[PDB]
Amino acid sequence: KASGTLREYKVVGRCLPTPKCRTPPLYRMRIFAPNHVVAKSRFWYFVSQLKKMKKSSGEIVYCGQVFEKSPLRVKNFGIWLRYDSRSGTHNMYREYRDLTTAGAVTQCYRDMGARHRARAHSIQIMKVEEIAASKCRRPAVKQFHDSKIKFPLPHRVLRRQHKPRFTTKRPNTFF
Amino acid sequence: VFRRFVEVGRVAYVSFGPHAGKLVAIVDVIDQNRALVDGPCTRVRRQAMPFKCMQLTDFILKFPHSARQKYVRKAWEKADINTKWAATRWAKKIEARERKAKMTDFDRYKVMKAKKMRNRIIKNEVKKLQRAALLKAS
Amino acid sequence: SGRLWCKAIFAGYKRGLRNQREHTALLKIEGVYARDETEFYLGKRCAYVYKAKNNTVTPGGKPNKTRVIWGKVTRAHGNSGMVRAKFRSNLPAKAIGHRIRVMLYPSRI
Amino acid sequence: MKTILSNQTVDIPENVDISLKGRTVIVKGPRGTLRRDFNHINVELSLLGKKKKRLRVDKWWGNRKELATVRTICSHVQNMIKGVTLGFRYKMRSVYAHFPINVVIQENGSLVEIRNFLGEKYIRRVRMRPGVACSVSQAQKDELVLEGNDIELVSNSAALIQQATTVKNKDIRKFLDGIYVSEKGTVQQA
Amino acid sequence: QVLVLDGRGHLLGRLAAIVAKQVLLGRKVVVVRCEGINISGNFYRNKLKYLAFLRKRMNTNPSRGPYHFRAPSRIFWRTVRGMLPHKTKRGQAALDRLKVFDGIPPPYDKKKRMVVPAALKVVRLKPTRKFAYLGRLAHEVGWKYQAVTATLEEKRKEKAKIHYRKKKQLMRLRKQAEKNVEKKIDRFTEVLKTHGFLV
RNA sequence: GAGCCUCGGUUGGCCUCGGAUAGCCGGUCCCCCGCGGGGUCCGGUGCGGAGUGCCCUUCGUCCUGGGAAACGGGGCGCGGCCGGAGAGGCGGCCGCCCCCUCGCCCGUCACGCACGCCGUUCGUGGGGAACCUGGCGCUAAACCAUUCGUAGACGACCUGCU
RNA sequence: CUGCGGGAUGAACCGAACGCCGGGUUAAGGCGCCCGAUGCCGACGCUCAUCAGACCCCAGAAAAGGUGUUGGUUGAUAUAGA
RNA sequence: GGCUGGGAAGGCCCGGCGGGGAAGGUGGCUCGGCCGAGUGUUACAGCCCCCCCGGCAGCAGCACUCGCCGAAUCCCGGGGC
Ligand SMILES: [Mg+2]
């Protein structure tokens, strides 16, 4: 599985009806996937991992993207992880600060890949929950919980190094 | 020795991006290199904007860190950020760059003639002043 | 009374790492360093001017030692302002890193 | 991670006058003037308040390694202020069993010669850092006093004269001989 | 029509790649003050690398072996040559256009020299990283003329200070003279500031 | 003045040191040092307008006929004073003759107007070789041959000879 | 018995198979210079090596350790004062 | 054209309910000229934010370009080889 700018999809599915069980129950899951085609595959993978259901023996009842309810508010997201290392698997809890839940999940994937060299296929997303300012364990998120937060830009290394390449003036880093 | 800080209500100038060359005010900080921004009086909606593409000026209006896009506009209008920005040397230099960009060939010819006369007059005056200074030194 | 052509440099032929196609030349126009300012120069006539030992004819003038190879700008080349050009005869490969003048009068503006 | 802001303040006395040339602290007082360039540290050196009562150092977006510089610069400034106000005096005692150590200052205190160390005919001439003056202490049979304004130079000279008297090719645990620093104090205690 | 570049504060490979690319395009490039070149990493790393390069020699006949030039200008020249097809006629012709100097020679001591922001240490290197000066590295591997270069550069800087003082006086007198006759150039100044000048 | 070969080009920038958790410009009432430098303080800018995102020069000619500006330029203009030694190879500062009214705005026409068609426009009196004008200065050395052994397989090397 | 693009180099690897050409687009691979192309105002983190690291075949390393640094799991005590 | 018969947002807001940052307030302390600036503590809202009851044209995947899938629910014009 690859990763891009992930979107949250709600997928509802059930096993195909049979004369023994006329009305099978409906199951839903939260799947973060680049598109719906891979969202269905991830839903089937997780359902087969949990229930005795396969794609051939079941069907997808509803698949739809879940829009962010408050895209304009900054929120703290807690994500519970289940990934595989070179050694055995481990359980993790990570906190991220983003405007959207899908953005938080993308940040979680990027951070896991950067810090533990874990690919997307090895990572299972268990639960993503928005959290208030309190109940945050990671000081990195907590240090931004300040109404009177101040910080300058000390070392602004200039870009456009190849905009006109030869100049008589050396650049400036203090602004 | 820093005089510019990322404060709630700081006015920032967007160097590059979709809303390039437009003023905007910082609402809340999202992360180390990302903050919630809002530009109601400068045709900029409320969305995240990285610190890389913004250079903040010396204008700071006071409003709560999570105002709902309405009180920030009121503070912007009361402080009259547009007029103060237009009075600054920064906006004047930006407008000079734009005027240079939009200058046509006829205008270039007029500027050439104007400089041709003006530089000669100024250099004649400079030579006279140099001669006077040399006379004074001796 | 002055210069009416833009300065360009014959950077090389269209090529891969180990194969070279001599029927298309790569030009480096001065002042153009992005794949957005090359739209102006598309279709512009380009010439490679050189002198030789023997005299040749000259339109509207006495015979001289100057000979040229005329060409045409075809398309941009890779985000850096590089321009692909095609000439009626392939360039001698002696002009690598030499002056090629691109004219201004396939005007369409 | 990156700490948003880390800072520490130094409360200087009214006697000391301190100025900063961007990131170079110049400290002058009763005993003299001390200079130390705090470049290559990338901190915000702020001098706030009238009469320059307090010196503040700031560090924005620094990791664990860059964080200790905030405390180390404050410690260096504290040592510099103490030296410019009270100074640093190092007392060291020469230890021997049979051969007595003969120490003589030569120019004023800068050139020190050590004689009869374990009976060695060789005499060690040790030069000290500028601004430090050595002397032969009184009221003690065998003691030396090192005085100066900069703690670094005095301590370096003390280390030089400690390492000058070293026993070679013998059990150092048995042959406990040489000159060792015994007390690290100030010239004036007040 | 000739590029003159000041080597102080520029990284070795970062400047070398750009200079080689410009040289291959028929441009004449002059690199000046090659003792100001700096290389990333601590001084001991680069010292060990140059010593390891010094170990490389032909066992049977070191005269035919690699040529270990000690001058910083020649070190930069070799680094640039490593980025050119010097075995071909085109590469040799391009390399002939390059010219490097230790210090700033009199032919170029009275010229304005450009800097490449894409090769500067302040831009490309973190402030917390360590670097080594090419002059000190060369002096410790066989260079002979570091002190002479330093003395000549000090004299050149004194001369440049005198010239810069004269330039300051000239510019200040120019600015005052503009104020003196500002009434006779009002119409010429208004049209200049209409199209984006003097603003 | 022709006369062969070889090419690149198609306005120049004649310059501080420099730091990047900082810098640029003046006056410097004040102090010190040799018109200038250094320090304190004060006042202006700093996404650099005392910006290479820049500056400098115009790239049609000639007639006369007005206004603004104005003593500027040229005759490889002729004679003196210098700076420059890193690989100087360039400029600065003064004396005397003659000539021109050049830059900006408008009147006034005339310039093979070659009737649409490409290498136009220059650095260049370019660089190398051979021949036609004058003024000012020139007079050989090297090698072979001979000689000697401080040298040597032969070359080579150290030496002597109006 | 098989050329061609890439893997610097090359039996078997990756892509893809061959008449002579013009234009366009791709695969596998790449875009600091050699060397065509990131001369993106690329995004998020990690890493200092006085043996750094840098892409299937493939051209090299193990057990065991490190408060060097960066995340996670569990367990206690701390204003009745660690 | 569809969607959550799009999610949020913009404007006048009206009659309420509770909760939380911790402010024209108080206040131990600190820095300057009652005020300006910085920290903490219970903390209603005259700085605000969030949920629950309900309703107005003002919308439209919006040139205030905050993130979709698209085309008998799709057509026109121009440039280069
Ligand atoms: Mg020509």
Side-chain angles (χ1 to χ4, degrees), chain B:
Chain B
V1 298
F2 298 109
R3 299 175 299 272
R4 305 283 181 84
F5 295 88
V6 179
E7 187 187 359
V8 41
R10 173 74 66 173
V11 178
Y13 177 82
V14 184
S15 306
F16 59 91
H19 305 84
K22 302 160 71 64
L23 290 185
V24 78
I26 300 180
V27 177
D28 193 67
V29 179
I30 308 302
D31 204 74
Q32 154 126 24
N33 47 13
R34 205 161 62 101
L36 186 63
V37 98
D38 190 37
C41 297
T42 55
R43 303 199 303 105
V44 181
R45 287 171 185 172
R46 172 168 295 190
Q47 79 279 346
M49 182 177 295
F51 293 137
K52 295 280 295 182
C53 60
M54 60 169 61
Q55 44 197 27
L56 52 102
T57 173
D58 210 331
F59 294 151
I60 32 186
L61 43 132
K62 48 185 303 178
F63 61 91
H65 65 81
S66 298
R68 289 186 297 100
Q69 211 268 353
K70 182 180 180 179
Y71 313 100
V72 52
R73 173 182 299 180
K74 180 178 56 181
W76 193 289
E77 291 189 355
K78 295 307 172 300
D80 197 4
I81 303 299
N82 297 334
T83 305
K84 270 68 178 180
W85 176 254
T88 52
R89 304 279 188 85
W90 196 346
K92 296 178 181 179
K93 292 188 289 290
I94 297 176
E95 181 172 338
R97 301 173 196 267
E98 186 161 340
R99 292 178 183 182
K100 280 289 297 298
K102 71 178 63 176
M103 178 170 56
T104 65
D105 50 357
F106 194 17
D107 301 67
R108 287 194 292 265
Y109 172 82
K110 301 197 197 72
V111 169
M112 182 269 295
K113 292 297 182 180
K115 295 198 308 297
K116 191 173 179 178
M117 190 70 263
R118 185 175 178 266
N119 292 128
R120 291 180 181 266
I121 294 179
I122 299 297
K123 71 180 58 181
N124 180 267
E125 185 68 16
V126 168
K127 196 269 178 180
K128 294 178 57 181
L129 261 54
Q130 287 180 352
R131 188 172 68 259
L134 262 63
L135 178 65
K136 285 291 108 181
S138 178

Side-chain angles (χ1 to χ4, degrees), chain C residues 49 51 66 101:
Chain C
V49 184
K51 291 181 295 182
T66 64
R101 52 180 71 173

